[PDB]
A paper describes a structure:
Bacterial β-glucuronidase (GUS) proteins comprise one class of gut microbial enzymes that have been shown to reverse Phase II glucuronidation and, in doing so, cause the GI toxicity of several drugs. In an attempt to gain insight into the structural and functional diversity of GUS enzymes, we recently reported an atlas of 279 unique GUS enzymes identified from the stool sample catalogue in the Human Microbiome Project (HMP) that clustered into six structural groups based on their active site loops, Loop 1 (L1), Mini Loop 1 (mL1), Loop 2 (L2), Mini Loop 2 (mL2), Mini Loop 1,2 (mL1,2), and No Loop (NL)20. Here we present the crystal structures of the L1 GUS enzymes FpGUS, LrGUS, and RgGUS, as well as the NL Bacteroides dorei (BdGUS), and show that LrGUS and RgGUS exhibit unique active site features not previously seen in L1 GUS enzymes.
Three of the previously characterized L1 GUS enzymes, EcGUS, SaGUS, and CpGUS, were singletons that did not group with any other GUS enzyme, while EeGUS clustered with two other GUS enzymes from bacteria identified as Eubacterium sp. FpGUS clustered with the new L1 RgGUS and three other L1 GUS enzymes in a group we have termed as the “L1 Cluster”. FpGUS, LrGUS, and RgGUS share a similar core fold with EcGUS, with 1.7 Å root-mean-square deviation (rmsd), 1.7 Å rmsd, and 2.0 Å rmsd, respectively, over 576 Cα equivalent positions. In the RgGUS active site, six amino acids from the Loop 1 region of this enzyme were observed to adopt an alpha helix conformation that directly folds over the catalytic gorge. This structure represents the first instance in which Loop 1 adopts a secondary structural motif. Interestingly, the L1 GUS enzymes LrGUS and RgGUS exhibited much lower kcat values (10.0 s−1 and 2.8 s−1, respectively) than the five other L1 GUS enzymes as well as Km values ~10-fold higher than that of EcGUS. For RgGUS, this may be explained by the alpha helix motif adopted by Loop 1. Docking pNPG into the active site reveals that the alpha helix motif would sterically clash with pNPG. Therefore, the propensity for the loop in RgGUS to form an alpha helix may explain its low catalytic efficiency. In contrast, no crystal contacts were observed within 25 Å of the EeGUS L1 structure. These findings suggest that while crystal packing may dictate the L1 conformation in some GUS enzymes, it likely plays a minor role in the formation of the L1 alpha helix motif in RgGUS. The alpha helix formed in the Loop 1 of RgGUS and predicted to form in the Loop 1 of FpGUS may block the active site of this enzyme for productive binding to this substrate.
Residue numbers in the entry:
A (entry chain A): 1 to 262, 266 to 597
B (entry chain B): 1 to 600
């Protein structure tokens, strides 16, 4: 279990917080001489770099956009003098992909994983009342011992080029907000809630972790601040009579309030009373079935790359609502915590995905996810280091996101090898670990490439429901062969039906690249009309199987990828353009999903 | 003299700040009932709204995008206990266009002007160690008594529709960051610096304004932190030996430090970075640090996909990397003061700025870009609304100058863009604006504005007031375009020959010239709207500029495609950008890069 708290920062009497967002100093370190040359003390010749954002798309030259290797940030903040006697942490929403944090010259901690928060305890070096310095050494290379997976090519000048095993640009930097926070010396470290429904009434079971021994009181407030339940102890049950349940696209948020007393700490968070259970082939939310309708997405916008902005969230949610979606998948990595906060208010359902993408050794991975070629990926001697990373990223993800009502499943892989017992052994461990970290035991899943065929795949028995990525009519029998493609699709769904697994299937990826404004009569692959015809055919197949309980189309919006001959300025399978405007097919979803 | 400080917020022991950026609560008020119905105490049915951002582009239906009238924002912040016995202010970078601030139920203050900071003293109503509430009524209508000017149509169902007299979309709301801050009870309110060059040495003349009577000392620190000058007094001269001047695209910044002292103690401390440099017009020449400068760059807009005018540092970083690749040294803040961060960063990068008050649309026309050369006068400055418009024009000027005057990057004030000037009612109007501006600026730096074609040499009455003359011309586009471009050139030269013959002996800058250019539209031979036509229009206008000794700058229109109100002459905004709205370059962007690499 973890040496820090994953809880979002708040500001009350006992807990303080100050934003470090703004313009930082930035400098590339291509010869990797920073540590030995005093950069922990300040950067020798930096530039200005916005935070949060991704560094790549600001520059005007290739070597800098495509930089791969070591690079540094530095900034300076004044701590209020009133934060003596408090524990003081730096909280980075993310450090992509790995980094060591230095503060006032001292190395505080290093982290691996570029999509989950990083906590640095600077209590012993922070100078309250004075100006303080923070310096972060970051690395954005890809390998097969960390997620997401890939490789690093050295070119003739010795400069490094990222060669990912995934299909999305390797944005990196400090992409999410950065805080400095003050906690009490005895503090709430973690807590977990589970829900039971008793007719109209409800139980909120909870457990609490603290950095101390003092008694804990837990209060639960309704939307208007009035009290509805109170229990003493670090373990308890809250009784909410005539409970107001969090519903799909109709949220109700209670407020939990955790206290440590003699009052030493207070933590407050919005939660939603709802239950998630798989009965047979159905997904039950509050004991009634739900059908998932929505999109795979990316944290991706012009200029900012993966940088968080609230304006992107607002628009992306006003578009999801306009299509009448109810659900999205945080593909292929946990998002910024603000996305889940807002999903909670709006009643969207989230499949939360750990970044286990790239577990097949292929640099053009999307044509290759149906080629039939096994890459011997889980037979290699780096696999134990990889497994340790994957489990640690699952643990940090679940701890961070488990108390959001919108999060209803965990996706623990996208398009890996599953056709050999080497991969069963691997994934069995991962699921085992995820089952222990989630106090609610909500459904665990992953998304399968076409190569994980019903006859050969070893891993679908680990899944509570099964997610399929399928491109019938695009990478398989596309264009004039599109009727062959429908058959082949039905052929496979027939074989899955024949297995009588009695579990739900969700299509988590299907789509066509579509250039906005390419019209052709008759339609051709890449036009707007072909996208509509494609979707109308996948819909017919989905609607032919009682156990298909969900469609998450790929993608919500055009996004940026590694450049290559099959990628025309990124990936054009969006239903919206990258500036968040709808292609002709968005209307297809809107109508179907009403 | 203003009842508050325009000084950007800092965080030291004496001064603390807290950001309120985030999701605020938002609610439209089409019936205009919020105050009588208690919205000052919280909104009844809100939705969430990013701050900073313009609200318009988030929504999916026209009624909300095109909303005009009253609308309300609300949030809640915790004030640390330790801020008892401090003066506590809310500081909005901007409230667009007018608004009334409420804090814990109480009307604190009102403000008119959508593009400069709003300061609201909440010291008597703030509750430290408790959670506090802010609520703002905003109105984004346009009128003829405030800037920028327009009108307001009432549709048949009672809906208000904005009808601006300007060519940009009427984005509005809380478009810039918002802070709550704590100041000392005796604080630095204001300061001003002027400079004189003394060979290897330099003088920094200054003056400080405080809110009490304890004494001031002023320190000056070089770039590396070391003390290079010190002076007691609220008015002084700092003596910098072996000064590092601030130079175009080669910036050096000192830190100035202003203390209010209680003998051996410190009451207040303010620090800003500044840059020693001098600006002077000598004849037809624009002298920076005693050498001539040719202005090369762009008129810009605070504009970006989804965010509207919302401020983001990444828009800044990208926009400056593009300006550097272009080899520009200049830009004008058309047509309103920008977020302060823009100027802070121009100081680090050494760009020259022309700072523009929002005095645009002073001529009644709703399709006003076909009408800046039409020849039709609209009696704009004889209306009885004009004395009110003058007062808020001066008020915005004083507020812009007080805010921006200490940036090295700011070399001149633009006080109008394309107004009617062919009339003595207009001379009498602008004599007052300029007289006002002269007083608020401690550096008496150059004042100008930008003239439409309508303001001909023989008819214009306002160019005498200008230390240099900015022209917006579109010969080869709105006038005599496409096949007739040969004629557009002779017409252009004929106008310039008349300016020449006046022998005014002042510098002329071209602040607008451009062609709508659709990215990707290629024609051989070229046609108006093709990328090829943009390049040729430009090569033509450069030949004209270069024929006149007194032309000393060229700011092309626009850096980037930007959003306007819609209509038949506007294909999803304005397409005179040299870059796209997503900040990639059309073919005429290298025309600039090459010309400007090889100028000075
Ligand atoms: Cl290059
Ligand atoms: Cl509509």
């Amino acid at each position: 279990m973890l040496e820090y708290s994953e809880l979002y920062p708040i500001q009350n009497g006992h807990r303080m917080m100050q934003s470090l967002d703004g313009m930082w100093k930035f400098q590339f370190d291509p010869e990797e001489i920073g540590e030995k040359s005093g950069w922990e003390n300040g950067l020798p010749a930096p530039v200005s770099m916005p935070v949060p954002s991704s560094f790549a798309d600001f520059f005007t030259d290739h070597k800098e956009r495509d930089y791969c290797g070591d690079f540094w940030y530095e900034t300076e903040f004044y701590l209020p003098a009133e934060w003596r006697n408090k524990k003081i942490w730096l909280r980075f929403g993310s450090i992509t992909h790995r980094g060591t944090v230095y503060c006032n010259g001292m190395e505080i901690t290093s982290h691996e994983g570029g999509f989950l928060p990083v906590l640095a305890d600077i209590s012993t070096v922070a100078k309250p009342g004075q100006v303080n310095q923070v310096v972060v050494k970051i690395n954005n290379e890809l390998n097969e011992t960390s997620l997401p997976c890939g490789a690093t090519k050295i070119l003739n000048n010795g400069r490094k080029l990222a060669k990912p095993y995934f299909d999305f640009f390797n944005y990196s930097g400090l992409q999410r907000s950065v805080w400095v926070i003050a906690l009490p010396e005895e503090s709430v470290k973690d807590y977990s809630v589970d829900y039971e429904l008793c007719g109209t009434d409800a139980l909120v079971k909870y457990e609490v972790v603290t950095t101390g021994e003092h008694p804990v009181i837990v209060r639960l407030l309704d939307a208007e601040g009035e009290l509805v339940a109170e229990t003493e102890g670090k373990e308890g049950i809250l009784q909410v009579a005539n409970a107001h349940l969090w519903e799909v696209r109709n949220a109700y948020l209670y407020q939990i309030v955790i206290l440590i007393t003699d009052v030493l700490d207070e933590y407050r968070e919005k939660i939603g009373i709802r239950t998630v259970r798989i009965e047979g082939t159905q997904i039950l939310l509050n004991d009634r079935p739900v059908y998932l309708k929505g999109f795979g997405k990316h944290e991706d916008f012009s200029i900012l790359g993966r940088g968080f902005h609230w304006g992107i969230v607002k628009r992306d949610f006003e578009c999801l609502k306009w299509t009448n979606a109810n659900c999205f998948r945080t593909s292929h990595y946990p998002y910024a915590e603000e996305w889940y906060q807002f999903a909670d208010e709006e009643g969207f359902l989230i499949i939360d995905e750990v970044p286990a993408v790239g577990m097949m050794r292929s640099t053009r991975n999307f044509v290759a996810a149906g080629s039939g070629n096994y890459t011997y990926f889980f037979e290699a001697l780096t696999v134990p280091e990889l497994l340790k990373s994957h489990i640690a990223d699952t643990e940090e993800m679940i701890t961070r996101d488990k108390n959001h009502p919108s999060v209803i499943a965990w996706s623990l892989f996208n398009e890996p090898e599953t056709i050999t017992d080497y991969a069963y052994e691997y994934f069995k461990e991962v699921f085992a670990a995820a089952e222990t970290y989630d106090f609610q035991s909500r459904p665990m899943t992953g998304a399968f490439e076409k190569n994980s065929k019903p006859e050969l795949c070893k891993c679908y028995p680990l899944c509570d429901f099964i997610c399929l990525n399928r491109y019938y009519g695009w990478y398989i029998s596309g264009g004039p062969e599109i009727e062959e493609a429908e058959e082949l699709f039905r052929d496979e769904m027939d074989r899955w039906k024949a297995k009588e697994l009695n579990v739900p299937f969700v299509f988590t990826e299907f789509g066509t690249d579509t250039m906005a404004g390419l019209h052709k009569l008759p339609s051709i692959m890449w036009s707007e009309e072909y996208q509509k015809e494609y979707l109308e055919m996948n819909f017919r197949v989905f609607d032919s199987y009682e156990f298909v309980q969900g469609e998450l189309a790929w993608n919500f919006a055009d996004f940026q990828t590694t450049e290559g001959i099959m990628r025309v300025d990124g990936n054009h399978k969006g239903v919206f353009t990258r500036d968040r405007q709808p292609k002709a097919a968005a209307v297809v979803f809107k109508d179907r999903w009403e």
